[PDB]
Amino acid sequence: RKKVAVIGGGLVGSLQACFLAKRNFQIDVYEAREDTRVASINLALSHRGRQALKAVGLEDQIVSQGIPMRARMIHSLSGKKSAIPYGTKSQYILSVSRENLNKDLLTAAEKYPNVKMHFNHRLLKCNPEEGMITVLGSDKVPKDVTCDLIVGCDGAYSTVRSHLMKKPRFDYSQQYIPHGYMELTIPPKNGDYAMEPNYLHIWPRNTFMMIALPNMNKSFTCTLFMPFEEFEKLLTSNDVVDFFQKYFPDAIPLIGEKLLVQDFFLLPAQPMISVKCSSFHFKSHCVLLGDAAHAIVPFFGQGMNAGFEDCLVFDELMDKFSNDLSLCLPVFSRLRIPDDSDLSMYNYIEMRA
Ligand SMILES: Cc1cc2nc3c(=O)[nH]c(=O)nc-3n(C[C@H](O)[C@H](O)[C@H](O)COP(=O)(O)OP(=O)(O)OC[C@H]3O[C@@H](n4cnc5c(N)ncnc54)[C@H](O)[C@@H]3O)c2cc1C
């Protein structure tokens, strides 16, 4: 039995646990955060992402909890709506709860005898060549443990990644992009959806935009993507309401003015990083999946779905190369990296037609 340390019990980490569990590895997952089953909110799941769940027999489980989006609904500056179908049926996407997907994936990974969950454990440091990691439980005693394979599934700020990268003469490397994001809610109207549920709703503007995905509880979660330069200018409730009157006129009625002003100032806008690694593996000891390998901002694509495909492709290599990691890893890097727009920046011009 070969020993695997999966760093990160998020979306990709939990998925990968299931894939590896099928291959009779000894898998220990280490999640810094607490078990969410005791203790953004939406995502669009794609056809490609589905395939990965199906490969571990979770699809129908997760699909039943999801609301299908079969077209875009565009909200123009004037507050008018227009529908745009997806070309192919395979472009349909599914709105799913982030939290509950993570819950389901974790339970699925525990259904396996050879999987043990280690919550409230934060990788402080690791050694790739040495196959050793340094974790930290709540008891707060740095204990070091060895392993055969380290799977960096520890998200956009991967600690595993920080150890696999070299560190040049003068680090002229910006981490964050100039855009930030903020979540709002369109609540139900009369115990039902305040707009058309089976659409991805989009308020495209040039340098900023909002999107809305439906929830099972008959609300929509909004996400507003804006340069910090713009967020900076919205200091008061009056500023916010003014901004929304001017750029998202139909949104205020849907969200409600009070609710908007409350939720807008719960937190600063959340920053985002755009990174890609030259390689997703070290030797035969360490591989990166999900945002650890490629942190994809939503403007340029679909991070979860990409990470889920990471798992699928990795699993296909394992079949292909009979669990030989010396081969799977390097080939994984080579085959994934070359896998490269609903949320692009544009003005939407209303025509007479
Ligand atoms: C606003 C927004 C909207 C998005 N919408 C979509 C969408 O619609 N569709 C889509 O496909 N993608 C979407 N994405 C991308 C998607 O959220 C990510 O790409 C995806 O969650 C990556 O999954 P992951 O497992 O790699 O990382 P994560 O989900 O971030 O999980 C990483 C885990 O590692 C843990 N961890 C971190 N450091 C340590 C450490 N040192 N020790 C131990 N554990 C650690 C964290 O606690 C976390 O549980 C969106 C992203 C953003 C920011």
* CATH number, domain with residue 350: 3.50.50.60
**What residues line ligand 1, using a CB cutoff of 6 Å?**
7-13, 30-33, 40, 43-44, 122-123, 153-155, 159, 181, 223, 272, 290-292, 296, 298, 302-305, 307
* Residues in the chain preceding a C-to-N separation beyond 2.5 angstroms (breaks): 39, 340
User: Which atom of ligand 1 is the closest one to the Cα of 272?
Assistant: 53
Q: Is 45 exposed, middle or buried (0-12, 13-18, 19+ CB in 10 A)?
A: buried
Phi and psi (nearest 5°) for 331? -70, -35
How far apart CA 79 and CA 71 sit, in angstroms, is 18
Confirm or deny that 305 is annotated as ligand binding.
yes
Nearest by Cα to 114 from 37, 264, 221, 2: 2
How far apart CA 291 and CA 156 sit, in angstroms, is 5
How far apart CA 212 and CA 182 sit, in angstroms, is 12
The number of folded domains in the chain is: 1
Cβ distance 156 to 291 under 8 Å?
yes
Dmax (CA) for the chain in angstroms is 69
Cβ distance 315 to 151 under 8 Å?
no
Q: Tokens 């898998």 appear where?
A: 27
Nearest by Cα to 107 from 21, 7, 26: 21
Gap from CA of 295 to ligand 1 centroid (Å): 9
Beta-bridge mates of residue 62: none
Cβ distance 201 to 212 under 8 Å?
yes
Asked how this structure was determined, the answer is: X-ray
How far apart CA 116 and CA 105 sit, in angstroms, is 13
Gap from CA of 46 to ligand 1 centroid (Å): 16
Gap from CA of 7 to ligand 1 centroid (Å): 12
State the DSSP code for 120.
Answer: S
Cβ distance 21 to 114 under 8 Å?
yes
In three-state secondary structure terms, 72 is strand
**At what angle are helices 325-336 and 303-320 packed, to 10 degrees?**
140
How far apart CA 273 and CA 163 sit, in angstroms, is 18
Q: Tokens 């995905």 appear where?
A: 213
Distance of CA 307 to the CA centre of its chain: 8
Residue-number span of the structural domain to which 232 is assigned: 1-353
Handedness of CA 30, 99, 303, 183 (dihedral sign): negative
Listed resolution, Å:
2.1
Give residues with Cβ within 8 angstroms of 218, minimum separation 6: 188, 191, 192, 193
Give residues with Cβ within 8 angstroms of 338, minimum separation 6: none
Cβ distance 104 to 234 under 8 Å?
no
User: Which atom of ligand 1 is the closest one to the Cα of 292?
Assistant: 26
Cβ distance 27 to 116 under 8 Å?
yes
Gap from CA of 10 to ligand 1 centroid (Å): 6
Give residues with Cβ within 8 angstroms of 340, minimum separation 6: none
How distant, in Å, are the alpha carbons of 80, 121, 275 from that of 175? Answer: 37, 25, 8
How distant, in Å, are the alpha carbons of 36, 47, 56, 270, 325 from that of 20? Answer: 22, 22, 10, 33, 12
